[model samples]
Target: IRVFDVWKKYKYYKKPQDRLKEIIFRKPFHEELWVLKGINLEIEKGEVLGIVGPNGAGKSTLLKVITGVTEPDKGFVERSGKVVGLLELGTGFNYELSGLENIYVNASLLGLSRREIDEKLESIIEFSELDDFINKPLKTYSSGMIMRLAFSIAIHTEPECFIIDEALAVGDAHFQQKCFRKLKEHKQKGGSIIFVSHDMNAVKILCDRAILLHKGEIIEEGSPETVTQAYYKLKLHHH
Candidate 1:
């Protein structure tokens, strides 16, 4: 996967009047907030790249653009092979739907056929460890339960490249460890990953390379340890 000179900007209105003025004038009555600026990145098969940044630093925006959940104002992204992105936990699920039902729904949206879903159904259920609650409505499940289900479906889809945001933090320590092992196995099988997280420890553990972003631009890109040190230093400087 590759992102070439990508840029994304949003209009921000400080007051309701600003929004109305922008609508009437059809231009520039509001601030133009650049979420990403001339961003470029590439990930090869079997490699894991970590993205780290302070809040609102365009980390999530970049992932959304890469996964086609959002579009860049300028530039392009190229993806090869099957790509699956988990930007948020339980996003595509229907609250009224049962967990079993949602499994089929989410899997289908990921481009899996019924036959394929059927084959993987047992594994997904097992991995989620939600046997008793599988038939319950999603609304009744706790946030952690929802995350487990979503994560299970994502990993079982056999994607060549996986893009994950900070969705793993909701899971228990045991399940989080299990998911990490699963990711490692996926990497061993030549799958690529783009991981976004504030957990510097996990970034150092999992990433081949890491990039730090601040206010829509890349500040540093290097080994995980090096970039993480820079990130910490930046944080300390702010204090």
Candidate 2:
């Protein structure tokens, strides 16, 4: 997949009424900024590519373009294959739905059929370790518990490639370790991934190549360690 000269911008409003008034009057009543600025990237088949950056560096914003939403203000993404992902915790979930029902809905968004989800439902539930909570509404679950369900369903849903946003931070180190082990096994079959993380160690260990984004730009792109070094330098200046 190749993203060519991608650019995305957002309109930020100070008040809820401003949004409605602007929409109704066809007037700009908000401050807008380019969240992504003329970005370029390529993802080769079956290669693990990592995106490393600080918070609000537009990492998630860029990944959203790859995930096939938000028509960027400029440029485009050329992509193929079966793509799926855990964009972020509860990305595609409905709070009113039970964890079990949400699994079906979430998997369907990635193109998994009902039968496919049914076949893997048990494994998904088992991986989450939520037990009885699986039958409870998502609104009642803790953030960590919700993370467990999201990650569990995400892992079990197969795809040619997937995108993950800081998924390694799964509420606890124990689950983090399990995710690491589970992820390593996927590479044996040449499954590809586009990953975003603040953990430099995870980027270096999990990705074959990486890019660093800052101030709405890809400041560096290369091996994991190469870009990670650049990221650390940027963080130092910011800190």
Candidate 3:
């Protein structure tokens, strides 16, 4: 996967008072906030890359760009995969539907055929450990249950590349351990995993390389231990 000179910007309107004045005076006032400015990155095939940064550093936005969920305003993003799975809680599942129904709907969005999903159904249910509630409406499940089921289905996709954004931290300790092991297995199987998290410790454990972003720009890239220490220093100095 690659991102070349990518940029994302959002237009922020002036205060309502300014808008009111503009309406009275017939003038316009707004400013463009360039969240990601000419960011560039590349990940090799089968690389388990970790993204770490402070809130609003555009970590999630970068994932969105790489996953093709959001387009970059400039430059290009490209990948060599049949599908990229971006897993965020409540993003793919419908609460009104049963867990079984949601698995099909979410899998279909990832381009899986009904037969293919059926083939993977048992594994998904087993991993989620929600066999009993598989027929229950998603709204009846707790947040943790919902996340477990959601992430289990995501892991079952057998995607060529996976973009995970904090979903791994949603469940209990046992579930987290299970999911981490599952992710490790996926990586060993040559699946490219892009993990975004606030847990630097987890990154060091799971990723071979890590990137630190600041204000939408990659400020550092190196060994997990080295980069994470530098990231901490920068955070302390910023205060």
Candidate 4:
């Protein structure tokens, strides 16, 4: 996977007509916030890449660019194989549907055939440990339960690249252990995993390569140990 010279921005407008007026008049009707400025990235199969940064450093924006949730204003983002992004709590789910139904819905959209989904059905439910509530509507489940269900389905999707954002920090700690093991298992299978985290300890332990972003740029990159140290020093430098 590669993101070449990706640049992204957000336009803050005071009123709805500002956007319309700007588009029609071809003028700047909104304040400009360039979140990501010419970011270039590449990842190989079986690599666990970790991203760390403070808020508004464009971490999430970069992920959205890479995942096709949004496009970069300049340059290009490209990847082969399936990329499943686990974004926040909602992901791609229907609140009105049952967990069981959502699994099939999510997996099917991931390009799984009926037979393949059927094969993985039991394993996914068991992996989630939410057998009791599988038949219940998603809106009825607890937040943790929703996460488990979303995570279970995501892993089962067997995506070539899994872009996860702060997913490990939530839910059960023991379950997080299982998640780490599962991630390793996926890594062994030549899956590329992009992990985002606030915990430098987890980043060092899990990431083969880590990047520290600041002011919409990767200020440091290398082995996790070095980059994490740079990150700490960066925080100290902020004062």
Candidate 5:
């Protein structure tokens, strides 16, 4: 696929005092920050791309645009097949609904019919280990429980391309290992992925290639070892 001259802008609102001061000075009160600029990329089928960046580096924003959660001010993303994104843990889930109901809602959003989910329902519940709380409201569940259920639903979508953004940090080490194994299985089945993560070791283990973003721009793209080593070097220097 191709990403050409991609640019994105976001607004920063100001408080009354700040706004008044800017207005009195005859300057713009709100700030328009450019999140991405002139980004060019080429990705082939079955590529596992890892995105590494510090906080507010536009890594999450890039995934959001790729998944159609948000639109860019300029440029477009071309793809070969359906894209399923796990940008946030339980992002589309309804807290007021029971775990069973949330599964139905999530599966429907992923383009699955009720019967289709029913076919996979047993396996899903089994993987999540949430059979006892399946009828309980999601709000009543703990964070780890919610992460487990959400990860289960995401991994079962079986999309052609998957996009994940920092969703694995919530689970325990054991569950994290399970999630990585699932990701590997997805790749083995001809799936592509764009993974956003701070876990250098995990990214190195799973990503075939990696890109580094700094302040909303692609600063470097190369093998995982090279890119991650450079990223840590930059981090240490900055601190």
Candidate 6:
């Protein structure tokens, strides 16, 4: 997967009048917020790339563009093979549906056929550790439970490229370890991953390379250790 010179912008309105003026004038009465500016990066097969940045630094925006949830205002993204993402946990899940029903619904949305979902149902349930609650409505599940279910579905569907945001922190230590093991196995099988997280230790451990983003641009890119040091320096400076 590759992103070359991508740019995304938003209209930032300071007040209701600004929004109304922009609508009426068909021009910028509001400030133009460049969420991403000429971002460039690439991920290869068997690689895990970490993206780290402070909040509102365009980390999630970049992922959304890469995953086709949003489009770049300028430039382009090229993706090869089957790409899957865990952007926000339980994003597509119906709260009224039972866990078992949601499994099928979410799995289907991830491109799994009914037969394939049936085949992987046991493994998904086992991985999720939600056997007893599988029959209950998703509304009754905690955020962690929902995250587990979403992650299990994403990994089980066999994606060639995976994009994950900071969804793993909600899980228990044991489950996080389990998920990391799965990621390692996926890497060994030549799958690529783009991981975004604030957990510097996990970034150092899992990422083959890392990038530090600031104010919609990549300020540093290299070994995880090097980039993370720079990130901390910037954080301390901000304080």
Q: Rate the local accuracy (lDDT) of all candidates.
A: 0.86, 0.82, 0.82, 0.86, 0.80, 0.87
Top lDDT hit: 6
Model 4, position 109, has a per-residue lDDT of: 79
TM-score of 6: 0.89
Itemize residue pairs with steric clashes in candidate 6: none
lDDT of 5: 0.80
lDDT per residue for candidate 5 within 17-98, as digits (tens), equals: 7677777888777889899886777656678999898887888778777766777799987766667776543656999999
Error of 2 at 117 (Å): 1.6
Which residue pairs clash within candidate 4?
none
Candidate 5: pairs in clash:
none
Model 2 deviation from the true structure expressed as Cα RMSD, one decimal place: 3.5
The best-first sequence of candidates by TM-score reads: 6, 1, 4, 3, 5, 2
User: Residue pairs in steric clash, candidate 3?
Assistant: none
What's the C-alpha lDDT at position 20 in model 4?
A: 96
Per-residue accuracy of model 2 over 1-239 as CA lDDT, tens digit each: 88899999998989989999998999889998899999999888778999988788898888788877667889998777566665533557999999999999888876789999989999888888998888999999998788788888877666667786685554576787776666666655667788878789988987999999998999999999999999889988976
Which one wins on TM-score?
A: 6
The alpha-carbon RMSD values of the candidates against the true structure, listed in the order shown, are: 2.2, 3.5, 2.6, 2.5, 3.1, 2.2
Backbone clash count for every predicted candidate, in the order shown: 0, 0, 0, 0, 0, 0
What residue runs in model 4 are displaced by over 4 Å at the alpha carbon? 14-26, 88-92
Report the C-alpha displacement of residue 227, candidate 3, in angstroms.
Answer: 1.4
TM-score per prediction, in order, is 0.88, 0.79, 0.87, 0.88, 0.83, 0.89
Error of 5 at 166 (Å): 2.9
Candidate 1, overall lDDT? 0.86
lDDT for residue 212 in candidate 3, whole number 0-100: 90
